[PDB]
Amino acid sequence: KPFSLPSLTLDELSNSRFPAPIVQLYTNPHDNLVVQPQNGRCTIDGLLQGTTQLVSCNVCSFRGTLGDGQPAMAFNIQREIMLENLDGSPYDPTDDIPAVLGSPDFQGVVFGILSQRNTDGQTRAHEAKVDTRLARFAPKLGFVVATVENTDFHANQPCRFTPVGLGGDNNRDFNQWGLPAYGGALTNNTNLAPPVMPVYPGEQLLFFRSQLPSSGGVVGGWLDCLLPQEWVQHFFQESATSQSDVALVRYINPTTGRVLFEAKLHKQGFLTVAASGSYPLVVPADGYFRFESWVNQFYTLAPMGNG
């Protein structure tokens, strides 16, 4: 019940908003952004929020029953997935969540594989895209549309969508901080984990950053999470009582043992730093965060610099 962090190094962690390794720490100003992801939301005393669930390989997956194909770009056949929960139990659209757990929490096209294993055991699997911006992207209601090129799919049989990366044509097709309309076009999102922002003037959010694969275009594919998936799992299991609203943490150089920078880990489940501008930190990827002490919101962090 004393608070703790996992000791996994930066390059041992994975993203909580997509199954991808963490490759960088990244900071930027929060001006004209609402930062309100729904995956990778866990308070540091262990309360999961939004669409956050614990299975790393399930983030941005879908599972359910595949419907008939209809027309309408090689990916020009649309098939609906009537969703289940990721464990195969019936999805309850009335649960106090924004959408089926694991649903993507960004506007974009997820590229991956749609696989099937029929009731008789016959299997198939092919490329597929799930466009989270579509009017019929409605995982709160329990329906999404998959777009495919291949005609070899069976209606009224189980399916699983395994995400691999992005499937748009350019950077404008991917808006990582824009939430989808989970209930479909022209509906209001519900049960959202709240937005996050620095409270101390001059501070910026610090993200754990991945770079996703992409099926087309000159696409950066950068995806920021508030906490890596292992920190989410750790806080959930530990459920340590938060002695204040701010845990001071320090990032350590593994060679020297020297502190490289300080950050605040806020109780709501995100980091801030004393930095200005938009950049990836220059720090050893085999460094790691160490919990130091409980402080208050007036604590002044040492300037981060480049890291």
Place this chain on the structure above:
Amino acid sequence: TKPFSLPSLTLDELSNSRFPAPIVQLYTNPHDNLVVQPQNGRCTIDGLLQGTTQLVSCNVCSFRGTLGDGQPAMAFNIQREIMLENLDGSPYDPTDDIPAVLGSPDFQGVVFGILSQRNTDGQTRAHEAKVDTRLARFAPKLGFVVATVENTDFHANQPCRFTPVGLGGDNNRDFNQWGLPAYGGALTNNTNLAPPVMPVYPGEQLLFFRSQLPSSGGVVGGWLDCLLPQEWVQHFFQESATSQSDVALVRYINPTTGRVLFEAKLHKQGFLTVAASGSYPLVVPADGYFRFESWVNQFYTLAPMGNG
């Protein structure tokens, strides 16, 4: 000096250490005529990784490197070599004390997935691909594997990443989960292997954390057993707790009643055994969980498992 513990994640909160897939069952079978020697998901309960085991869940069975030119040889009928890097993009050292590049598949089969690229100029593409671990040129110890593709839209001498999704064979005989690939290529001897595992108490059987993989063709079961889930591997690595004996007694608990459903031994080498006979999935709640009970010795007699 450092007390032992298990993660408190339930069965349906865990993932496989030999492939990125959820754990769906606990499974037991006799070890007769099997050498059980997986190389992923190998961690001693005091935190020593072995074989090709690494800590990133989404990297298990992935490959990374530079894609080569296409050659012929039936939809997946173009072959392209991947010259491998480590999964973090650092240069792969074929002389490290490991069986193959960390994360390499540890079974004979065809891995179906996506081969993606981001060129030096930023242009991207990604398409279906298969990696057949039985091929003569499957040689991740040397640092080369062959990807088979249908799509002609790939660029040679540009970076690539293979993300595994499931199996890509045509039938159950194309997948042999306990058969190791020849990591150095055809007609070469494997090195630096995590050792085989087996029950020592007569009559006991291994207990596995089991997943079911997707498949691109055939009536394929896709069942994959690991010795420890990926989260236990991460936990033991971080904790590196003192093993007071070679055998930790653990019990699987019903979350509704709090009742013990069955007992198992968690051996220091990093695997479970049970007092059971035959080949079957346990009938237990998927939201149950293991609880560490005490340190015992190899003579401890487990209560019969039954169905679970």
